[PDB]
Each structure stands twice: as C-alpha cells, then as structure tokens.
Structure 1
Amino acid sequence: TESKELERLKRIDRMKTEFIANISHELRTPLTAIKAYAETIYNSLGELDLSTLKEFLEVIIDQSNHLENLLNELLDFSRLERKSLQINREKVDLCDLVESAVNAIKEFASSHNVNVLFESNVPCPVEAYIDPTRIRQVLLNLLNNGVKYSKKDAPDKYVKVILDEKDGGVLIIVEDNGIGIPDHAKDRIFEQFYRVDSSLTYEVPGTGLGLAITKEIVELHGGRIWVESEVGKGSRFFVWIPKD
C-alpha cells in the first residue's frame, strides 16, 4: 500500500493547502470592512446622524459574524484533522430546533427558487439529550446541500425535513428533488474535501468538509448517517440519534 499511501497523502495535502489559501483570503474582506467602518465613525465623532451611526455599526456586526463563521470553518477543520471535536448534551425540543433551522435557510432557498418544508410524523414536543448547536449545524449543512444541489430548470424544487422516532431514538430525514448522487460516489461523499466529480458543471462552490463534519458530529452523538438517492430523481439523507 505504501506506494499508493504516499500518492493518497500527497493528494490530501494539495486540498488542505487550497483550503487554507482560500479561507485566508476570505478572512481579509470582513476585517478590512470592520477597520474602515470603525476608523470612519471614530474620525467623525459627534458629527454624524444617529441613522448613519446605526447603519455603520450594523455593517461592523454583519462582518464580525461573517468573520466568526469563517473562523469556525477553520476551527472545525482543525478539530477534525486532530479528532478533537466535542459535544455537549442537553434536553432540547427537536421540533422547534429543526423549525428554527428551516427559518434560517429560508432566505437562501428563495434565492435559488427552492421551497423549504418541515413535516412531523409524531406529536411535536420531540425531546432528546443532544448538542443543540452542533445538531443545528448538522441540519443546516444538509439543508444547504439541498438548495445548492437542486435541479437547474425544474418546476417545483424543494427541501423537506421529516422528523420521526425509529427503534428507540430519533430519526431525521432531509429530502430533496435535486440532481441526485451517482452510485459510484455513494460512499465517497462523507469523506473530507470530497466533491462530486461533476461539481454541477463547476458552478457550485464548496470546500467538501460539510458532510465530513456532519458525520463526525452525528457519530459523536452515538448515531449514524446514511444516504439514499436515485441517479437523477433526488436525495434522502438519514440521521439517527439515540436519547441518553
């Protein structure tokens, strides 16, 4: 294997480099913006409108969150390669957790003409002892993939979240009529840096970490994640999580 093991590790290193290169340049933009807006407010104290003062500060905050997002992308990668990712379990109502997650990606789905739908197969006070942030992140990664990898010119594009109870834990299904995943890459999608060979004709951007961090979180919960997709009809992502 050694002859190919070098070839494999050498391939990973190229992608690791490209990721750091991209994220470094991305972090520069919000910072520049924060600096400019701060130095402008500072240089012009007591001389500007409350309305202007308000807007300029909102920009400082938006950019701070964007910078935080990117810094989290980097830290998530760091904790993944180091296998240092952790979880904090607490009682959360999953019905409103997925509902809050749906409402967060609604604006992004509208931009790509995609309907966001949440369906519950059981009464809605579904509670489990799980990490609320990290499972929300799992939900958002899957929802984002459903909007990003939808059909190009199709009449009724959707992403649907189906919440149920299987065996003894909780089962979440993220369904989409979208492009579907070819059967050769069915296992490869959860790997680090991996994207579909097509890349949707290179139109869609992505680091390929999404599903790798998702899997890791799901498994740290003592659960498993799998996919069922037809080559050109759509995709169903399956997440099962225990309860204490």
Structure 2
Amino acid sequence: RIDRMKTEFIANISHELRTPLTAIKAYAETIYNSLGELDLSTLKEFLEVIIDQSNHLENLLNELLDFSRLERKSLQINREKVDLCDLVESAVNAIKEFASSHNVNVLFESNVPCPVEAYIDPTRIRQVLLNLLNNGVKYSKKDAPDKYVKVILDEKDGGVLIIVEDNGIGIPDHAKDRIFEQFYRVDSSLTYEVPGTGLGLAITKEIVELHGGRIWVESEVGKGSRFFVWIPK
C-alpha cells in the first residue's frame, strides 16, 4: 500500500529539489567566477534567482514537514473571522509569477457578493488554495492559447463552497478515487516531466477535514478538472 509507492516518492523528492538546486549552484558559481563580467543589474538579477529558487525549495520542505505534522496529528488548527474574498485575491497574487511562467491566466469570480465571512484558519486555507492553484498551473495543457485556473466562490448548505476550475489535461476515472492519497501521482506521457511528491492534495484533504469540511473532484480527460472545497461557518 504505502510501502509500494514510498520508493517512487523518495525519487520524486530528489527530482523536485534538484531543479532549484541546479539554479542555485550554477548562478552562485557564475557570480563567484564572473565578478569582472557582470554588470550591476545582472549581478542583482542573478542574486534574485538564487533567492527565488531558495524560496521554492523552502516551500517544498514545508510540504514535507506539514505532511509529517498531519500524519502525527500534531497540527492543531486555530479558527478566526476571515474574509475569503481577500484570502482568494491574496492567494492568486502569490501564484501569478508561476502562472505566467507556463502561460496560465488566473481568475476570480464570486457568485455571492463580497466580502464573505467565515470562521477558518487563514494560514491553512491559504495553503489549501495555493496547492489547488499550483496544481491548476502544473497540469495545464501543453500547447494551448487559452489556459486558465479560476477560483469560484459561493455560499451553500450553511457553509462556503470554493471551486477551483481548470481546462488542463484532466484526470482518468480510475485515478479520480486516488489523487487525494499520499504519494499518488498519475503516471503518463502528459505528466512525465512535471515535478511533484503526491503530497499536496493529501495535505489539502487533511486540512479541509480538520475544519469539518470535505474536498472532492470532477474531471474529464482532455477537458479539465473542478475541485470543490466545502467548509461550514
């Protein structure tokens, strides 16, 4: 079960941490050996690369740590009155650079009028949003002119309903029941070069369920996917 997919997971951590490290090592050694051949704006640009690549590396270590905290039941959420319209706007801001990197537009529409109120942990639900947004970009179409990720906000069943919609590669029907489990990743020609651990949605699920909420998915292969997050108030 877990012991099967553990070896692949170990190789996957290796591959995803390797990419920013390559940039860090290459940019740092270049600066070190090219001090006479760098103008000031290129030196500062190259330092920013080291910094931004460190930050991605830091995000990946926080994924590993949050997962071990969730498995150990060490993560105690702390709820408070929060505006989800601002939370969602703040989340799409943070993802914009990575989105334009893969030519994916990021959208936000609320069916109910803003601002919407909810009793949630802002840090942990921000973490839920970003994982779904990151996924929308990571698994978007290869060569397409109209790629997108849309966060749609609504109030239903005495609670908030956040939908994250993409028009990406989609998810096979057999995989739909397993995407939320730890270490699981769809293995195909369309996800061979896409880095990841298979921990994101497991972390998202456990966080959502700590809030007494649920997460589910609908997907068609070649069309796109919708992730539904329901949390009460």
CA separation of 1:37 and 1:129: change in aligned 2, threshold 3 A? same
Superposed displacement of residue 47, structure 1: 18
In structure 2, what is the Cα distance between the partners aligned to 1:57 and 1:82? 37
**1:147 equivalenced with 2:129 (yes/no):** no
Question: Aligned with 2:35: secondary structure?
Answer: coil
Q: Is the 8 A contact 1:95 1:125 kept in 2?
A: yes
Give the RMSD, CA atoms, in angstroms: 3.6
User: What's the TM-score once normalised by structure 1's chain length?
Assistant: 0.78
CA 183–221 in structure 1, closer or farther in 2 if over 3 Å, else same: same
Cα 1:59–1:97 change in 2 (3 A) is: same
Distance 1:17 1:98, change over 3 A: same
Q: 1:236 to 1:45 in 2, by over 3 A?
A: closer
Q: Residues 80, 159 of structure 1: CA spacing in aligned structure 2 closer, same or farther, 3 A cutoff?
A: same
Instruction: Judge conservation of contact 2:24–2:50 (CA < 8 Å) in 1.
Output: yes
Q: Deviation digits for residues 102-130 of structure 1, max 9, x if unmatched?
A: 11111111121111100011111111110
**Contact 2:5 2:184 (C-alpha < 8 Å) held by counterparts:** no
Determine the C-alpha separation between the residues in 2 that align with 1:156 and 1:47: 40
Moved more, 207-216 or 100-109: 100-109
Within 2, Cα distance between the matches of 1:227 and 1:16?
A: 24
- In 1, Cα distance between equivalents of 2:111 and 2:232: 17
Equivalent pair of 2:81/2:117 in contact (CA under 8 Å): yes
Partners of 2:37 and 2:187 in 1: CA distance: 56
Contact 1:88 1:131 in 2 (8 A): yes
Q: How far off its partner does 1:151 sit?
A: 1.6
The answer to whether the Cα contact below 8 Å between 2:149 and 2:164 also exists between their aligned partners in 1 is yes
Change (3 A) 1:206 1:29: closer
CA distance in 2, matches of 1:211, 1:43: 42
Match of 2:60 in 1: 70
Paired residues of 2:131 and 2:201 also in contact (CA < 8 A): yes
- Aligned CA distance change for structure 1 residues 58 and 169 (closer, same or farther; 3 Å): same
Of the structure 1 ranges 15-24 and 97-106, higher mean CA displacement relative to structure 2 is found in 15-24
Shift of 1:64: 5.7
Segment drifting more, 200-209 vs 185-194 = 200-209
Contact 1:222 1:242 in 2 (8 A): yes
Label 1:111 to 1:124 Cα distance change in 2 as closer, same or farther (>3 A). Answer: same
1:7-57 CA distances to partner (integer Å, 9 max, x unpaired)?
A: xxxx52354455456657977998999999999999999999999998898
Structure 1 residue 155 displacement after superposition: 2.8
Q: Say if 1:239 and 1:19 are closer, same or farther in 2 by CA, change over 3 A.
A: same
Answer yes or no: is the 8 Å Cα contact 1:23–1:74 preserved in 2: no
- Same amino acid, percent of matched pairs: 100
**How high is the TM-score relative to the length of structure 2?**
0.81
Aligned CA distance change for structure 1 residues 162 and 46 (closer, same or farther; 3 Å): same
**Distance of 2:147 and 2:35 partners within structure 1:** 50
Q: How far apart are residue 85 of structure 1 and its match?
A: 2.4
Higher relative contact order (CA 8 A, sep 6+): 2
Q: Can you give the 5+ residue segments of structure 1 that lack an aligned partner in the other structure?
A: 1-10
1:180 to 167, 170, 182: 170
Distance in 1, Cα, partners of 2:116 & 2:65:
31
- Are the aligned partners of 1:34 and 1:59 in contact in 2 as well (CA < 8 Å)? yes
In 2, Cα distance between equivalents of 1:231 and 1:54: 43
Contact map agreement 2:214 2:230 (CA 8 A) in 1: yes
Deviation at 1:60, TM superposition (A): 7.6
